[PDB]
Ligand binder design. Structure first.
Ligand SMILES: OC[C@H]1O[C@@H](O[C@H]2[C@H](O)[C@H](O)[C@H](O[C@H]3[C@H](O)[C@H](O)[C@H](O)O[C@@H]3CO)O[C@@H]2CO)[C@@H](O)[C@@H](O)[C@@H]1O
Ligand SMILES: [Zn+2]
Ligand SMILES: [Zn+2]
Ligand SMILES: [Zn+2]
Ligand SMILES: [Zn+2]
Ligand SMILES: [Zn+2]
Ligand SMILES: [Zn+2]
Ligand SMILES: [Zn+2]
Ligand SMILES: [Zn+2]
Ligand SMILES: [Zn+2]
Length: 421
């Protein structure tokens, strides 16, 4: 764990000014690890970081398959890395792997989302950026299609997709099927966004046996409504022609240039689309098309969080925590990359009527319930089991199963796991 120098105590520019080492920072931003990156690349951020700390050297390592490779590395339990973006590992294991930045109580004072990546009152991960759950869209394609107001319900959304399919040349909704994480992203919409309830994720979901079934009183809400949105898009012919060959890098330029109308991704994705071509002002961001009793909701959550390897020397832990502190407070990464800065001190107009909510903690003694039901059901809700979402695309496309049948398969597995825990 930490060496007696806590994240709130770091005097930026003062502390650790005497250290001379190299630290290794693993992250998912392969694009930023190139000199071609359209915006501010890693070299630049570290160029600026060294203006203030010339003798802390930072080796940036990036992997396209980040979730699996970071987890494998994490499980190897060595000192081959100093910082990584934290992969899909249960919070109860953070103590095994990561250095605590400090008591959550105190991190709250200095950072947003202090209890997102935390256990037993200590905060082990700091979000690199706060991201809102919405949809990236091409405004020009929408006009071309004669869409006037943005869709707020699943039926409105499919009607708009159909307009795009019939009156434009753009793929209405591009799944990015081959990217496991892009499919896993649909789970970022099923709790706050689909229910308006900040307690859904950590309380209602893991105490509900069959949460994926159609909500009978409000059938256009709740997780079913999200997953059906994907199913219907694929099955009605509103997605790419060949899901098996989607290409994520290509799709940026394609949406910039009007060849794609929508992609269901978090707000981090907007500037990446904007810089992919000459048509940045054509990219917008809209709320996900669910309305709950007259209001729309969008969950704010962390993008990848920084984690510090607990196996490294006291000296390397410190320089790591300093580079985090700097990235957080002085780099300006989070804006530049299209989200909410995490240092604790007005977004798209399309969201001005959206209630922004964040998941609340479980009740006392139930903090580990979701992770345990998730593990036993093997559904991996909001982990990066993109696999079950890939399953939706495949079966909607080959028409072998209805969404009701898919959701019932998940419920049976979830319901066993709920009773078991
Ligand atoms: O579900 C985990 C985590 O996902 C975050 O979003 C990530 C993606 O999961 C993915 O790693 C994505 O990587 C891109 C990168 O943005 C760039 O496009 C590069 O060219 O290609 C890689 C993929 O190879 O980056 C985003 C943003 O970090 C985000 O949704 C979190 O809230 C979530 O917990
Ligand atoms: Zn994999
Ligand atoms: Zn895959
Ligand atoms: Zn109901
Ligand atoms: Zn009401
Ligand atoms: Zn168990
Ligand atoms: Zn199947
Ligand atoms: Zn199955
Ligand atoms: Zn029971
Ligand atoms: Zn029980």
């Amino acid at each position: 764990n930490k060496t007696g120098i806590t994240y709130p105590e770091i005097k930026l520019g003062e502390t650790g000014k005497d250290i001379k080492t190299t630290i290794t920072f693993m992250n998912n931003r392969t694009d930023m690890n190139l000199d071609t990156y359209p915006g501010k690349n890693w070299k630049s951020y570290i160029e600026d970081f060294n203006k203030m700390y010339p003798n802390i050297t930072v080796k940036v390592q990036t992997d396209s398959n980040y979730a699996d490779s970071a987890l494998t590395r994490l499980q190897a339990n060595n000192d081959s890395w100093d910082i990584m973006m934290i992969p899909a590992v249960d919070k109860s294991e953070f103590s095994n792997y990561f250095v605590p930045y400090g008591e959550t109580s105190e991190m709250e004072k200095v950072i947003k989302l202090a209890d997102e990546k935390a256990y037993d009152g200590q905060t082990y991960g700091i979000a690199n950026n706060g991201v809102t759950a919405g949809i990236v869209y091409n405004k020009k394609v929408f006009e071309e299609a004669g869409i006037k107001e943005l869709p707020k319900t699943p039926e409105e959304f499919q009607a708009d997709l159909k307009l795009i399919k019939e009156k434009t040349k753009a793929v209405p909704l591009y799944t990015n099927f081959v990217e496991d994480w892009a499919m896993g992203a649909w789970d970022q919409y099923i709790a706050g966004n689909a229910t308006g309830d900040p307690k859904f994720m950590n309380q209602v979901l893991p105490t509900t046996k069959e949460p994926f079934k159609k909500d009978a009183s409000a059938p256009d809400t709740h997780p079913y409504a999200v997953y059906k949105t994907l199913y219907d898009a694929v099955a009605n012919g509103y997605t790419e022609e060949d899901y098996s060959t989607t290409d994520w890098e290509s799709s940026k330029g394609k949406m910039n240039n009007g060849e794609i109308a929508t992609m269901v991704l978090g707000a981090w994705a907007v500037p990446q689309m904007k810089q992919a071509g000459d048509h940045p002002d054509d990219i917008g961001y809209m709320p996900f098309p669910i309305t709950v009793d007259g209001k729309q909701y969008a969950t704010i959550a962390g993008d990848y969080s920084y984690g510090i390897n607990k196996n490294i020397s006291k000296e390397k832990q410190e320089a790591s925590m300093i580079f985090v502190k700097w990235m957080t407070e002085d780099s300006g990464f989070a804006k530049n990359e299209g989200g909410i800065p995490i240092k604790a001190d007005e977004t798209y107009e399309t969201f001005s009527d959206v209630e922004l909510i964040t998941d609340a903690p479980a009740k006392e003694g139930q903090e580990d319930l979701l992770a345990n039901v998730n593990s036993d059901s093997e559904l991996g809700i909001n982990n990066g089991n993109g696999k079950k979402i890939q399953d939706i695309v495949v079966d909607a496309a080959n028409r072998t199963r209805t969404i009701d049948q898919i959701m019932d398969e998940w419920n049976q597995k979830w319901a066993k796991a709920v009773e078991d825990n």
